[model samples]
Target: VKDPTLLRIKIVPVQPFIANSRKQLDLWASSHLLSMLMYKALEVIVDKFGPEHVIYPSLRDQPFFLKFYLGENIGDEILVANLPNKALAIVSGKEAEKIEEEIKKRIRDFLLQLYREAVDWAVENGVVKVDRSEKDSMLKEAYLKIVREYFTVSITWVSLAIYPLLVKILDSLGERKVTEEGWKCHVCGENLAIFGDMYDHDNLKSLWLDEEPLCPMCLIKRYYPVWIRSKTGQKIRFESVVDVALLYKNWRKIFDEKYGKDLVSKAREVSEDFVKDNMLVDSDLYYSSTWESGLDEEKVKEVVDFLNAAYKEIGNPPKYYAILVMDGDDMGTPQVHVAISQALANFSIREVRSVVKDEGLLIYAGGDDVLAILPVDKALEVAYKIRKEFGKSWKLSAGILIVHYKHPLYDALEKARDLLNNKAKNVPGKDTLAIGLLKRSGSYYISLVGWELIRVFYNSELRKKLLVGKRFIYHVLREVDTWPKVGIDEMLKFEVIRHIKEETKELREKIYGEIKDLLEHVRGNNEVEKVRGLFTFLKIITDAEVFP
Candidate 1:
């Protein structure tokens, strides 16, 4: 963000994509339909404010007269152009209102487009009138949410303030304190969202050595100094820092050492020289990574229609998709992938092929994890189909992921990955699962304490405690009074910390006693697993109701 020119924006999904898993044609229509709805909403906004007063970044880059498809919904000013004296223009809003009497006209246009697309898809795909009617109702509700949110409220908020107000907003959006040291993204050599995550990263040691860590996005490496070597290879020459080009000269020698003297010789077959930005990275062929061949525009449209339908039917649309992992057991041998494919084909799910990319990203090393997104109603049906096809041979774990419905194409992909990570820690065969929805009311306090406890345990990586700590955790579970209250006062916060220390005290002592025995008995991944199991068992004692 440049000085005197800044923006503050937040985006939310009013309706989420939802539908059958196998109806490809219908799914295709559902996917693109929402973007159309967005246009209609903006049209209503434009009617009152006109183009100049309305500022939506999405409008400017859209294809001529095709802004509806390019973007839908209002999420701050996506595009901001300075107009001298700190004044900025929001392009998306400029032409919308002038095009019609009211922006609702555009919103209604979007609703109609959505309905038509869905009907077209349903009819072509052999969806009957009765079932289509049900779907139509669902889509209509979804469309209304879009209209109300974007054109009604959010778009309305756009009228509240303009460029000048927004500049102040952008400045206040970031952390209150961020020094120059915190600005760089260690891993990508770019500016970071905040300085805190950068300097506070846990694996600074490995990062300093230029090695990859779990969060590969937050590491940085400095450039190597330049140097030179003699043709005879008998002497090495070094330039002092005072030397004008000392750094460059030193780097040149390194380049020569790594590559051959003929650094520029294309066909010389010189030694290898690898170079990159201010980061050193080692690539891995992980099957879990996504190749992202690219977005499936047609399928996306169909999904959008489904999203609209879901909103109409359920009022809130859909945010999460349930992924049913089917691994065959003694019941039958039907392959999980085969079952998933059949259901998708039958249900008309758009981008059904996306599941494969989601699970493996074309990485050859990861084994058999099928990533999928399906309508909530169809999820159970898909699960049952898999269970029936594979019999008992299959063991399954499911994860619900919330995909970001509104964003730039690439950002949507990044968001999906983040959601996927939410379920990665789930252990198989232990009934490990995570609820996708927010916690029910009244349980917020319990969740907070539970979370704090878990964080402390995991962050500590308790290797020193043993049976005694395990007993203390079990005691806490048996007696809830020991748990800290929410919004703890400063004194109570310290008291809570003291309780945590006391609970682990005995366990720590026991761990020391077991260390010798543990070392004698443990080795390799299997042994490591046993140690983890023991550690987890101790933590579970703290809250059997939650962890068990």
Candidate 2:
């Protein structure tokens, strides 16, 4: 009931209560320490950027969200616990970068002090010599060079520079819009559609598996006659030099690998032979495959069968709504079109006639479509029946736009149309797309339905409005139509239940044409009673003031 179809459900979490309040306070204090440090990083950005511009401190999320991103699926859980204690822990965890200024002041200062002590000890002992190889002993030499020179201060500066460089590089690569062109295919020489395609095509070309031009007889014996001008202007039946050039590359590879540089002179000969044996010629295509797509025929048959069967279920109908959609055929195929209309006429109408007992249920032929109004569940029940019966096989795309009765009618119509357009576009070139809206225009339709129900059931005018100097409640007032087929008794009962728990104030106003100035009452202290009464009146008036 929260939504028309009830897709999303609301949930609340419950935790055990601790009797010791002090223990709970201690838990809260310790839990948020890391969160505080993370927020400190974000605060640095806010300071530098004048509280308006952005300074990305290696983060792009809300302060709370950035903390959640430090570990696996941290956002899904409402609590964090059982994590590694030390900030230096890296193997099985992730954490925010230590704040820059704080690290230099604390960690760097401590490290420098320890380094000074080590240098002083090394100088006093004169421990320079080592039995290890020069490459292995490089670390000792490097440490001596650092202490011998002003290395500590220089390294600190370099470390500070490197941190900014790292930040810059990461940001550049992670930018939202970075479009760089990639590699090309060697065989086609055109830019490959994508990087993956380039790799596949390049691998194929490297093997020379794609080359196949002439038969062995034409290559080895030159038996086939060819007419071409020679260099000396003589017409001769001979194989062309272009054929020989093509094989040069393959032969060169084989010669270089087998005989080394000694066979460099004969590389051209090997290449020519390879080219003659593997010359490639491609075929010209005359015709290609034509694709025809549409609804699954089997599913369409199943739907037709189910609809015809469901028709027999309804002997007397209640409140309901029906919608039919028509899609014109582009190929002058009226048979399928006719089948669609006939299905609606036979199945939908018959089902409603049997199930709903009410007489006043609307049944209108909306041009190529149909419209029926009824209770919300019955409408959905029919929709599910259509989907379950034939949905598996056919390209029957249906757009069911459900709205509350109090929603605006025109807006609901627009929503239904949009759903219809989406359904039509999604279908596979051939299929039926249907549009239906259930209980749209909630407040507006409620008033309209209430007006009809009151006049018919109570046979009473809630109020009289002057029209052309004549007071009339409703011009279209009748308990039943003249037609004998109309079921008036059922309609009266259904409507009477709707207006049973009427509010006294609204009913009194409707009878006497007196107004209640609610806005005037709202401007006061201690108006709780007035507010409560107003809410109660609205609730009962909306639901026909009926008692549960």
Candidate 3:
């Protein structure tokens, strides 16, 4: 007879790995790399313990391992890198400790194989356009050490043979610190660059995708799009901030009818395909802030001509994009972990990508967490649709940030995480969505309300009715902002009604009824701020920026 052991697996450095990115491609590639690592480790358990025993991710409707390893019947709807960093399963066998150790070694070996494959692919495909004579030295000793020590896998299990089997595992495999002397990676700034030993910065423009030097690990992450595409026969089509900024449904119509079709090809000639076959990819063409990178005088003039033509033909594209982060509200207990996992898996794998498809980009959706980028118009709708599809078994919280396209991508990601954690989760009922607007003019506005408020914002009647009445909303918000610390609720309502300048009684009541729903989440002790936030939210959803 064999004893059952509850196995918990955690992969390391997920956030740091994700955040250490200089470009959107790097951010997405690192996320995929981390997901791949988790996928390999999770496959070890599924092979040993069967899919039913895997608890958290709830093998329901999800893609990846079964699709790739077993060639099972799953939909091929362009899989995003998913599967959370930590996983759980129940396995029954003797020498369970040995099983754990074996799995760890297998994951380590998998990473080793991936590293070797990337290097081989790079050399075979001539990934480095310019070769320095010391390329051999870059791959020899120091590079090998970095690759070997990169991953930190921690595993813990408790034998079901014990009573009250509660296991609380802190990090067992903590970070292995290095002095990180000599030159450093421009992306992470914590690791020694592959070029550190040689100071070789000569003809490797394409080698270090960034103009600055990158460490070997970041370089490996950058290889993901090509490597995965070649192996899986799936084209990894990435949408840039520029793509999201121009994500309106009518954008193609605007380009084709209004602007001459030759404009894109002309821009491409100057940017070397930075302007894609259709839309813009590099910010230099769209944003004035990035022109400071200083293109060659003639190249700069050509780009200015392209922008001039586009602006003259079609209106200026939106300067802002949205980042949405969502997590499960409160499913921290094991009794319902499996049930919630199934619901979450269905929502993530089946519904999330479809909801985000034409309007935005779904970066990741594993378990209960979803990360995505969107144009302003559809962000709240995307969040609401995913929340609705998640069903009654569990609730989810989200944060949506509208930020300038020129903002640091990492800072935007970090702000979305903080908004999800602090603004949404910290709210009274906790099942909330927080939306923030970050203007480049040093102004910030954030609002937190129940998920249903999205419906109110999207209501055709409310949107159109409020769109022309923002000045009235401004009056109400301006009134509340100056209110004293002590106040009565009905007087506030009276003030709201007093500020309503609508002509018809029905129109006044309809808007008031909606605002009433928005105010239910409002509480005292700083109630004025919530009221102001609600109207600021009203202000945002009503703005042409959001509706556009």
Write the candidate numbers in order of decreasing TM-score: 3, 1, 2
TM-score of every prediction relative to native: 0.27, 0.17, 0.84
Candidate 2: list runs displaced more than 4 Å. Answer: 1-345, 348-362, 365-368, 386-395, 429-548
Give one digit per residue, the lDDT tens place, for model 2 in 1-548: 11111000001111111111121122222222222333333343344332222221112323233333343332311122111111110011111122234432333333233344433332333222222243232234333332222111100111112433533343344232222213332222222211223235444343222321111111111111111011112211111211111122232234234432322222223234212223211100000100012214353343333323322332111112222222222311223433443443333333323333231132221112223333333333343343333332133333334343233333444555455455443444433333333432343211101111222223334323210111111111122212113342343233333332345445444433221233122211233322332222223232211110
lDDT minimum window of 10 residues, candidate 2: 282-291
**Candidate number that wins on lDDT, 1 or 3:** 3
Candidate 1 lDDT over residue span 276-389, tens digit each: 232111111000011112113454343344434433433332222222332222211113433443432222221222232222111110012333344333433343443333
What is the C-alpha lDDT profile of model 3 across 1-548, one tens digit per residue? 26766677777762288876667777777777787878777777777666787886787655676677677745435447667887777777564566677767887677666666666665556554345454565568777778767766776776662222343432232122111215777778778866665555453333564465666787677667777776676644544676677665455446656553555555566666567557555544554334536454676666566666676566656778889999988854555667767867777777887788756777788877898888787787788888888764378899999987778888888898999997788876688888888887768888887876666556646667654456776767777778744563664556546655335577656766766666765422366776777778877766654444
* Candidate 3 residue 484 C-alpha distance from true site, Å: 7.4
CA lDDT of each candidate?
A: 0.29, 0.26, 0.69
- Candidate 3 residue spans exceeding 4 A from truth: 72-78, 120-133, 161-164, 167-181, 200-210, 256-260, 268-314, 333-337, 484-503, 522-527, 544-548
Which regions of candidate 1 are displaced past 4 Å? 1-36, 39-96, 99-103, 120-445, 449-456, 463-471, 482-548
- Decide which is better by TM-score, 1 or 2: 1
- Return the lDDT, model 1, position 71: 40
